[PDB]
Scaffold this active site. Sequence first.
Site, PDB file in Angstrom:
ATOM      1  N   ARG B  61      36.593 -51.449  -8.332  1.00  0.00           N
ATOM      2  CA  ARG B  61      37.816 -50.861  -7.817  1.00  0.00           C
ATOM      3  C   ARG B  61      38.885 -51.908  -7.537  1.00  0.00           C
ATOM      4  NH1 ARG B  61      39.241 -49.235  -2.432  1.00  0.00           N
ATOM      5  NH2 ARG B  61      40.680 -47.450  -2.377  1.00  0.00           N
ATOM      6  N   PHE B  66      47.184 -54.481  -3.439  1.00  0.00           N
ATOM      7  CA  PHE B  66      46.360 -54.022  -2.329  1.00  0.00           C
ATOM      8  C   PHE B  66      45.125 -54.914  -2.264  1.00  0.00           C
ATOM      9  CE2 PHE B  66      43.278 -50.500  -0.739  1.00  0.00           C
ATOM     10  CZ  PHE B  66      43.217 -51.119   0.505  1.00  0.00           C
ATOM     11  N   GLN B  69      38.031 -54.892  -5.197  1.00  0.00           N
ATOM     12  CA  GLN B  69      36.760 -54.553  -4.562  1.00  0.00           C
ATOM     13  C   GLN B  69      35.557 -54.659  -5.491  1.00  0.00           C
ATOM     14  OE1 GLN B  69      36.721 -50.644  -2.788  1.00  0.00           O
ATOM     15  NE2 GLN B  69      34.545 -50.730  -2.235  1.00  0.00           N
ATOM     16  N   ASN B 108      33.259 -50.902   3.702  1.00  0.00           N
ATOM     17  CA  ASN B 108      32.247 -50.158   4.445  1.00  0.00           C
ATOM     18  C   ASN B 108      32.480 -48.658   4.347  1.00  0.00           C
ATOM     19  OD1 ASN B 108      34.015 -49.140   6.583  1.00  0.00           O
ATOM     20  ND2 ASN B 108      34.089 -51.258   7.337  1.00  0.00           N
ATOM     21  N   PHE B 119      35.885 -57.036  -0.479  1.00  0.00           N
ATOM     22  CA  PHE B 119      37.152 -56.953  -1.185  1.00  0.00           C
ATOM     23  C   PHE B 119      37.981 -58.193  -0.897  1.00  0.00           C
ATOM     24  CE2 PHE B 119      40.066 -55.725   2.316  1.00  0.00           C
ATOM     25  CZ  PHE B 119      39.189 -55.230   3.280  1.00  0.00           C
ATOM     26  N   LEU B 128      43.924 -52.406   8.153  1.00  0.00           N
ATOM     27  CA  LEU B 128      42.469 -52.544   8.060  1.00  0.00           C
ATOM     28  C   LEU B 128      41.904 -53.410   9.185  1.00  0.00           C
ATOM     29  CD1 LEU B 128      41.961 -53.058   4.208  1.00  0.00           C
ATOM     30  CD2 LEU B 128      41.918 -50.940   5.554  1.00  0.00           C
ATOM     31  N   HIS B 132      37.547 -53.550   9.262  1.00  0.00           N
ATOM     32  CA  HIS B 132      36.815 -54.293   8.241  1.00  0.00           C
ATOM     33  C   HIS B 132      36.707 -55.752   8.658  1.00  0.00           C
ATOM     34  CE1 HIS B 132      36.789 -51.011   5.262  1.00  0.00           C
ATOM     35  NE2 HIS B 132      37.840 -50.627   5.962  1.00  0.00           N
TER      36      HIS B 132
END
Lengths: 11, 170
Positions: B61, B66, B69, B108, B119, B128, B132
């Site tokens: 991903r 951004f 991942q 997660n 990521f 985030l 995270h």
Amino acid sequence: XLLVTAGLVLA
Amino acid sequence: SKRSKVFFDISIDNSNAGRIIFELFSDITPRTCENFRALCTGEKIGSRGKNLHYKNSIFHRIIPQFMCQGGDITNGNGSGGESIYGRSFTDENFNMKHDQPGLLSMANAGPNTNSSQFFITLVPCPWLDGKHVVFGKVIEGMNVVREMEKEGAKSGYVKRSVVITDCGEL
């Protein structure tokens, strides 16, 4: 939206 | 030294893109960093009998502007993953924030559900923070990270194969 998940990625 | 140094050799569309070298915040999040470090050397055996290893895993991903991942070493699509502490482990702490690009953070599925997925930030991701665990940063190879960003899309699906062809500790 903008998240970093494992399995249910949402908006 | 105090902090561990690990690396990923990245292949994009079956072509070497270079090496990414990470500095792990072993002094701030020891448990979290140890898991990642061990997954780079493949020194631990998982619940399926295979040694947990990032080698040959993929970045499933990637969303431009951004993050990138990866780390789903069991299913390679985000639904799997496994840590040296089991299917999941608790959130150590959130001292470090996603205030810049090139940060290594844990993906997660809600509170205390860290496994092997992680990521790399492509921009600051303040939304985030506290959710995270940021446990490392890229100290070399940010160009490679930018090369990977190029392979992403708004949907997150990666049309061309982005793979970790080699990894380990330095």
